[PDB]
Amino acid sequence: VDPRIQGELEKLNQSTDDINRRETELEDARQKFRSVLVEATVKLDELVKKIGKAVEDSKPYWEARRVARQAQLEAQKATQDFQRATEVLRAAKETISLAEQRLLEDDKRQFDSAWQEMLNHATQRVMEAEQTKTRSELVHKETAARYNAAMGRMRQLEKKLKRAINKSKPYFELKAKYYVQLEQLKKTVDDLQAKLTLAKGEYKMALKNLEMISDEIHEAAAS
């Protein structure tokens, strides 16, 4: 079948054009990343020569400042898992206390039967709550000191070698301005790269049809 093959032919040649285009789109994306990279580093290395020793002496603090953020997020879990534990205890205390008012009387006729299932659950609820409470109230304590020690150490390392930290300030800033630029560029290249392989992938997929179509037209030929 001649009409069967010519249609498939047009498709593969359109793919090769699209791929050839997208390859060149990456080339401009690749070399521009190469260019920005080397351009970035001649600036940062120049800063090193300006102020070298201070930056080295500054790194004990910045690593400690990193720990400051990490020690904090330990507390963020501790305080909130404790806040939840206190609320669960209160809501269960409420469920019990409201039941307790109707529990002293036992005079409720139609109400007492309804109440007791609620009470028995709540009394079994507090069994679980107080334990997660005591666990969380201690976790609240563990992270807290580390958070105080981290600040205390940061503060101690703040007050010590301030001079070192002052001179290193511009270095980490151009480091940060380039860092956020590169992270954005990598994603542009990486996502284009993925889009390449899907195109080169669907191109290989289109050729497999030809093998099958040649195989398929072969059966018709035998007749």
Numbering used by the authors: 41 to 263
Which sentences did the original study use to describe this structure?
The Rab11 subfamily plays important roles in specific trafficking events such as exocytosis, endosomal recycling, and cytokinesis. SH3BP5 and SH3BP5-like (SH3BP5L) proteins have recently been found to serve as guanine nucleotide exchange factors (GEF) for Rab11. SH3BP5 exhibits a V-shaped structure comprising two coiled coils. The coiled coil composed of α1, and α4 is solely responsible for the Rab11a binding and GEF activity.
Because computational secondary structure prediction assigned the N- and C-terminal regions as mostly disordered regions, we selected the central helical region for crystallography. We found that the R260A/R261A/R262A triple mutation reduced the degradation and obtained diffraction-quality crystals. This construct of SH3BP5 (41–266; R260A/R261A/R262A) is hereafter referred to as SH3BP5-RA. Finally, we determined the crystal structures of SeMet SH3BP5-RA/M167A in two different crystal forms (I41 and P41) and native SH3BP5-RA at 3.35, 3.6, and 3.8 Å resolutions, respectively. The asymmetric units of the I41 and P41 crystals contain one and two SH3BP5 molecules, respectively. Therefore, we obtained five different apo-SH3BP5 structures in total (i.e., one from I41 SeMet SH3BP5-RA/M167A, two from P41 SeMet SH3BP5-RA/M167A, and two from P41 native SH3BP5-RA). Although these five apo-SH3BP5 structures exhibit a similar V-shaped conformation, the superposition of these five apo-SH3BP5 structures using α1 as the reference shows some flexibility of the conformation. The hinge region of the V shape contains staggered hydrophobic interactions so as to maintain the V shape.
